[PDB]
Design an enzyme around this catalytic site. Structure first.
Site, PDB file in Angstrom:
ATOM      1  N   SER A  93       0.892  -1.244   0.000  1.00  0.00           N
ATOM      2  CA  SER A  93       0.000   0.000   0.000  1.00  0.00           C
ATOM      3  C   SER A  93       0.903   1.259   0.000  1.00  0.00           C
ATOM      4  CB  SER A  93      -0.995  -0.116   1.206  1.00  0.00           C
ATOM      5  OG  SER A  93      -1.646   1.090   1.677  1.00  0.00           O
ATOM      6  N   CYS A 187      -4.749   9.178   3.744  1.00  0.00           N
ATOM      7  CA  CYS A 187      -5.515   8.875   2.535  1.00  0.00           C
ATOM      8  C   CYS A 187      -5.368  10.058   1.536  1.00  0.00           C
ATOM      9  CB  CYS A 187      -6.949   8.584   2.970  1.00  0.00           C
ATOM     10  SG  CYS A 187      -7.939   7.990   1.648  1.00  0.00           S
ATOM     11  N   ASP A 214      -8.287  -6.457  -6.454  1.00  0.00           N
ATOM     12  CA  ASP A 214      -7.928  -5.568  -5.374  1.00  0.00           C
ATOM     13  C   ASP A 214      -8.784  -4.318  -5.568  1.00  0.00           C
ATOM     14  OD1 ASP A 214      -6.611  -3.375  -3.956  1.00  0.00           O
ATOM     15  OD2 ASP A 214      -4.685  -4.359  -3.986  1.00  0.00           O
ATOM     16  N   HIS A 243      -6.677  -6.994  -1.165  1.00  0.00           N
ATOM     17  CA  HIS A 243      -5.569  -6.039  -1.066  1.00  0.00           C
ATOM     18  C   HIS A 243      -4.560  -6.389  -0.006  1.00  0.00           C
ATOM     19  CE1 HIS A 243      -3.864  -1.929  -1.427  1.00  0.00           C
ATOM     20  NE2 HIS A 243      -4.194  -1.615  -0.205  1.00  0.00           N
TER      21      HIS A 243
END
Length: 264
Positions: A93, A187, A214, A243
């Protein structure tokens, strides 16, 4: 005192040093089930990103961390403090983006990258499918502010993908542990990052891990990474959905890690 602040742990032993760097909404515990497959053959460095709920959130400096280069500086400071001159890096990520940037800053230190849940850009662009439109992120940011707990409740099983309830429960635990303003700010920072122009500066060999689906990463992003990363790159496919395959399919992912970490 980053070694203390970011909960740095060195386990295992060996000449082949591996750093595990977790992604959004988890902490280093996300590696727990893959770890035992690595510690007989490698010295493993784990740490928590400053945005993890396992780190005191009063260390989160919103100004400093409004770009990923500050997370890169924390990773390089830990590796230099530990006197490590060379390693393989496994990033999930946001940490796949951190590892790409760190490998360009310090090509001496990064001998191989393994990238999981990886993308150079999540927003779509002309002839570029990132997976997200601007109006959709505007709504994600609003839902995270309006009701972070409802957002995290709904996101955890979507991100885990596969119906693996233990993994949904573990990812929900660390997403609910994140301070909600920090979770929104990381984010936002990820969505403003576009690494496409620097991909060809990576010199390390790289393994891109691809699962069947994902929710954050379209299937075409792995091939875009393989075409543009500057090092020798392969795409390793895992026959599993989601994911966070280190939470939901840890033995299957450990196959790919042991193979990719065998020589570097």
């Amino acid at each position: 005192k980053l070694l203390q602040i970011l909960n740095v742990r060195v386990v295992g032993s060996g000449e082949r040093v591996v750093v595990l760097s977790h992604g959004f909404g988890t902490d280093q515990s996300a590696w727990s089930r893959v770890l035992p497959y690595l510690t007989r053959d490698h010295r493993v460095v784990l740490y928590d990103l400053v945005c993890a709920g396992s780190v005191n959130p009063d260390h989160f400096d919103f100004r400093r961390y409004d770009n990923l280069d500050a997370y890169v500086d924390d990773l390089l400071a830990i590796l230099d403090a530990l006197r490590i001159p060379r390693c393989a890096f496994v990033g999930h990520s946001v940490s796949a983006m951190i590892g790409i940037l760190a490998s360009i800053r310090r090509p001496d230190l990064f001998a191989k990258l393994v990238l999981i849940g990886a993308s150079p850009r999540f927003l779509n662009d002309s002839d570029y499918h990132g997976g997200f439109e601007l109006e959709e992120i505007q709504q994600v940011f609003d839902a995270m502010g309006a009701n972070y707990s409802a957002w995290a409740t709904g996101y955890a099983p979507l991100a885990v993908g596969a119906d693996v309830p233990a993994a949904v429960q573990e990812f929900s635990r660390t997403l609910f542990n994140m301070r909600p303003d920090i979770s929104l700010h990381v984010c936002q920072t990820v969505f403003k990052t576009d690494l496409r122009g620097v991909l060809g500066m990576v010199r390390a060999p790289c393994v891109v891990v691809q699962t069947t689906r994902d929710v954050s990463v379209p299937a075409s992003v792995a091939a875009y990474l393989k075409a543009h990363l500057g090092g020798r790159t392969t795409v390793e496919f895992l026959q599993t959905e989601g994911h966070l395959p280190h939470l939901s399919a840890p033995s299957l992912l450990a196959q790919v890690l042991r193979r990719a970490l065998a020589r570097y």
